[PDB]
C-alpha cells in the first residue's frame, strides 16, 4: 500500500540506464515468481481433490509458503517498478490493486485451505479462478505476459469440450447404471461419475489458473499431472463401464471415454507446443532448415562412422533440393529479379556444398 | 572486433563523464562508495594488466581464438575500470581530480585500442617478431597510463612521488659519490643505527595505520621517506670516511638493499591504501617489514 | 608462461657457460640480452600474480 522510497536517480544517462535495467529484472522475475504463485495454487487442488485420512498437508504448507514468499517478494518488486513508473509517467495504482486482488484472492485460498473451512470444493475452485483471473490481470498490468492469446485459448476451448463431453459420458454412465441388475455395483458407477464430475472441475481450475502463466515450467507439470488426474478418473469410468453387463452402449461410453483421452492428449500437446514456441510466427523454411540443423549436429557428433553419414548426407541433400526447389519457385514469385538470382546462386552453392558431400 | 567495438562504446561512456564534468555534477550510483571505488579501481588495474598479459602470451602462441577471448576479456577489464573511473568522478569535489580520472581513462582505453588493432595484425599475420615487441611496448604503455590512474588520487601520489624521490637520491647517491665531511666512523655509525631504528620504528606506525587511517598513513610514511633520506645520506658519509674501499662498496650495497627494501615497503604500503580490507596483502606488508628490518641487520 | 621462462633459463644457461671466464664485454652484453627476455617472463608472471579474481578466498 505504501509506495516505495525513490532515493535519487540524476541525470546521468548511465544513471537512467541501470535503472531501466533493474526495472526489466524486476518485471522478469515477479513474472517468474506470480507464475510459482499459480503453480503452487495448482498443486494446491491436486492435493486437496484426495480424501482427507491420506491428505499429506505437507506439500500443500510449502506451495503456501512460496506464495507467501513471492508475496512479499511481489512487494518488494513491483514497488520498485511502480517507483521508477512513477519516474517516467507515474501510474503504478493500476498494478498496485492488481498485486491487492492477487493477495486476496491468495488469503481467499487460504480461507479455503483449513479443514476447519467445511465448505465443499468447488468453491475453493471459484476462488483458484479468481486467482488464475487476478493473475491475469497482473501479468498484462505489467504486459510482460500474453504472448499471444490463441493459444490460451485454444487450450481453454479445448478443456471445456472435454468437460462437455465428460457430462454426456456421465450421461451415458448413469443411463447403463440404471440398467444394471446389481444393486451396489452402480453404487460404484456413482462414485465414478462423481469424482470424474470433480475430476473435470478442477481440470477446468487448472485451465483458469494456468492461461496466465503458461510459461513457466512448473505450470506445465502441473497440467500434466492434472490430465494424469483425469486420467485416473477416465480408467474409473471405465471400470463404471466394466460394471455393466454385455450391452452396446458401455461401449458407448467407452468410445466418450476414448475421446475424453484423446481431446485430454491434444490439449496437452497444444499447450506443450505453446510453451514450446517460437516468438515469431512460422518463417519461411524452418523445418527445413530445422531438419538441417538436426543432420549438421548429428553429423558433427559423428566422426569416424561413415554407416551414419551416408544416411544423414542422403536426407540432407534430400532436404537440401527441397529448399532449393522451392527456392526456385519463390523466385519465381520474386519480381525484382535480382533476388530471384541471389536465391538461385545460394541454391547453386548449396548443391555445391551437397556435392563435395557426396 | 567487439572488442574494439567496445572500446568505442567506452569513449562515448568518457564523453558523457566529460559531459557530466562540464556539468560539474555525477550523481553516484545508489550502490558505488568512494571506498568499493577503489577496491574497484584496484582490483580492476590488476584484472586488465593480467588480462593484457594473456594477451601477449595468446599472441606468442598467435592465431588463436582465445586471442579474442582474451580481447573480449580485457574489453569488460576497460569497462569494470569504466564503473571505477565513473564512480570516483562522481564521488570527488576537485575539478582537477575528475578531470585526470577521464584523462586517463581515456588514455588507457585510447592505447588499448592500439592493442585491440594491433593484436588483430597478429591474428592475421603469423612469424614476425617485431609484432611482439609493439605489444610489448604498447603494454608497457598502457601499464603506465594505469598507474597515473590509481595515482590519480592525491593522498596516494605524494607518498610513492616520495618513494620515488628517495629513490632517485639514493640513485643519484649511487653513482660514486662522495661527500667531503668525512667526519668519524663511531659517532656516524651510531646515530645511522638510531635512523635504522627509526625507520623501522616508523614502518611499525605504518603497519599500524593500516589498522587505522589512510591519511595517517600518507603522512607517516612521508616521515620514513624523509628519514630513510637522512639515513642514505648517513650512509653516503659512511662511505665517505670508509679506511677501505671494499669496505665502502659493502656499505653502498647494504644501504641499496636496504633502499629496494622500502621500495617495495611502500609499493606494498599504497597497494594496501587501496583497500582497508585485504588482510592478505597486509600480511604481505607485514613481511615486506620484516625484509626491510632484514636489511637494516645486515 | 612458464615455458616461456623455462626456455629463457636455457638461454641463462648458455649464459652461465659463456660469460664464464672470458671477461669479455661481448659476453655480458649476451647474458643481459638473454636475462631481458626473461624479465619480461617475469613481469608476465607478476602480473598473472596479480589476478585479483584469482588470488585470494579470505576466511571470514
Redesign the interface.
Same mark, same amino acid.
Given at each position: 500500500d505504501d509506495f516505495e522510497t525513490l @532515493? @535519487?536517480?540524476?541525470?546521468? =544517462? =548511465?544513471?537512467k540506464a541501470?535503472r531501466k535495467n533493474k526495472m526489466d529484472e524486476s518485471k522478469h522475475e515477479i513474472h517468474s515468481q506470480v507464475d510459482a504463485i499459480t503453480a503452487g495454487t495448482a498443486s494446491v487442488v491436486n492435493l486437496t481433490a484426495g480424501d482427507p485420512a491420506e491428505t499429506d498437508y505437507t506439500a500443500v504448507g510449502c506451495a503456501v509458503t512460496t506464495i507467501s514468499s513471492n508475496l512479499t517478494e511481489m512487494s518488494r518488486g513491483v514497488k520498485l517498478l511502480a517507483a521508477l513508473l512513477e519516474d517516467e509517467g507515474g501510474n503504478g495504482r493500476p498494478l498496485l490493486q492488481a498485486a491487492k486482488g492477487l493477495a486476496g484472492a491468495v488469503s481467499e485460498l487460504l480461507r479455503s485451505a483449513q479443514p476447519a473451512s467445511a465448505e465443499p470444493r468447488q468453491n475453493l475452485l471459484l476462488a483458484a479462478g479468481n486467482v488464475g483471473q487476478a493473475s491475469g490481470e497482473l501479468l498484462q498490468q505489467i504486459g510482460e505476459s500474453d504472448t499471444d492469446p490463441h493459444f490460451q485459448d485454444v487450450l481453454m476451448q479445448l478443456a471445456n469440450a472435454v468437460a462437455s463431453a465428460a457430462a454426456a459420458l456421465v450421461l451415458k454412465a448413469k443411463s447403463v447404471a440404471q440398467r444394471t441388475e446389481d444393486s451396489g455395483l452402480q453404487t460404484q458407477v456413482i462414485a465414478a461419475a462423481t469424482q470424474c464430475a470433480l475430476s473435470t472441475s478442477q481440470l477446468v481450475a487448472c485451465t483458469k489458473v494456468v492461461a496466465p502463466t503458461i510459461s513457466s515450467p512448473v505450470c506445465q507439470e502441473q497440467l500434466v499431472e492434472a490430465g494424469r488426474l483425469v486420467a485416473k478418473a477416465v480408467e474409473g469410468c471405465v471400470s463404471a463401464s466394466q460394471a455393466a453387463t454385455e450391452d452396446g452402449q458401455l461401449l458407448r461410453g467407452v468410445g466418450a471415454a476414448a475421446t475424453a483421452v484423446t481431446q485430454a492428449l491434444n490439449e496437452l500437446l497444444q499447450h506443450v507446443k505453446a510453451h514450446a514456441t517460437g516468438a515469431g510466427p512460422a518463417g519461411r523454411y524452418d523445418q527445413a532448415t530445422d531438419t538441417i540443423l538436426t543432420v549438421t549436429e548429428n553429423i558433427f557428433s559423428s566422426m569416424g562412422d561413415a554407416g551414419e553419414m551416408v544416411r544423414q548426407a542422403r536426407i540432407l541433400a534430400q532436404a537440401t533440393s527441397d529448399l532449393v526447389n522451392a527456392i526456385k519457385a519463390d523466385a519465381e514469385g520474386e519480381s525484382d529479379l535480382e533476388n530471384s538470382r541471389k536465391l538461385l546462386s545460394a541454391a547453386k552453392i548449396l548443391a555445391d556444398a551437397t556435392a563435395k558431400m557426396v | 572486433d567487439s572488442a574494439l567495438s567496445v572500446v568505442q562504446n567506452l569513449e562515448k561512456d568518457l564523453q558523457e563523464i566529460k559531459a557530466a564534468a562540464r556539468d560539474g555534477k555525477l550523481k553516484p550510483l545508489p550502490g558505488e562508495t568512494m571506498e568499493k571505488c577503489t577496491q574497484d579501481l584496484g582490483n580492476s588495474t590488476k584484472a586488465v594488466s593480467s588480462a593484457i598479459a594473456k594477451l601477449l602470451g595468446e599472441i606468442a602462441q598467435g592465431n588463436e581464438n582465445y586471442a579474442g577471448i582474451a580481447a573480449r576479456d580485457v574489453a569488460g577489464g576497460l569497462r569494470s575500470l569504466a564503473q571505477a573511473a565513473r564512480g570516483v568522478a562522481a564521488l570527488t569535489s576537485d575539478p582537477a581530480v575528475q578531470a585526470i580520472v577521464l584523462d586517463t581513462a581515456s588514455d588507457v582505453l585510447d592505447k588499448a585500442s592500439s592493442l585491440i588493432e594491433e593484436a588483430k595484425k597478429a591474428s592475421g599475420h603469423p612469424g614476425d617478431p617485431e609484432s611482439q615487441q609493439r605489444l610489448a611496448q604498447v603494454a608497457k604503455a598502457v601499464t603506465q597510463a594505469l598507474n597515473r590512474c590509481v595515482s590519480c588520487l592525491p593522498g596516494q601520489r605524494d607518498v610513492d612521488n616520495a618513494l620515488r624521490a628517495v629513490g632517485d637520491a639514493s640513485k643519484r647517491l649511487l653513482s660514486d659519490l662522495l661527500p667531503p665531511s668525512t667526519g668519524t666512523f663511531q659517532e656516524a655509525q651510531s646515530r645511522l643505527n638510531e635512523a635504522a631504528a627509526g625507520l623501522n620504528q616508523a614502518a611499525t606506525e605504518l603497519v599500524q595505520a593500516s589498522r587505522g587511517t589512510p591519511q595517517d598513513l600518507a603522512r607517516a610514511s612521508g616521515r620514513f621517506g624523509q628519514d630513510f633520506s637522512t639515513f642514505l645520506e648517513a650512509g653516503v658519509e659512511m662511505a665517505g670516511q670508509a679506511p677501505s674501499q671494499e669496505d665502502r662498496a659493502q656499505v653502498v650495497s647494504n644501504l641499496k638493499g636496504i633502499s629496494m627494501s622500502s621500495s617495495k615497503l611502500l609499493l606494498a604500503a599504497k597497494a594496501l591504501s587501496t583497500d582497508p580490507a585485504s588482510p592478505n596483502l597486509k600480511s604481505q606488508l607485514a613481511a615486506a617489514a620484516r625484509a626491510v628490518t632484514d636489511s637494516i641487520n645486515q | 608462461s612458464a615455458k616461456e621462462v623455462a626456455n629463457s633459463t636455457a638461454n641463462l644457461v648458455k649464459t652461465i657457460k659463456a660469460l664464464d671466464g672470458d671477461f669479455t664485454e661481448e659476453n655480458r652484453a649476451q647474458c643481459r640480452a638473454a636475462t631481458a627476455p626473461l624479465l619480461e617472463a617475469v613481469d608476465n608472471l607478476s602480473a598473472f600474480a596479480s589476478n585479483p579474481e584469482f588470488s585470494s578466498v579470505p576466511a571470514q
Open positions: @532515493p @535519487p536517480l540524476g541525470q546521468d =544517462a =548511465a544513471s541501470w | - | -
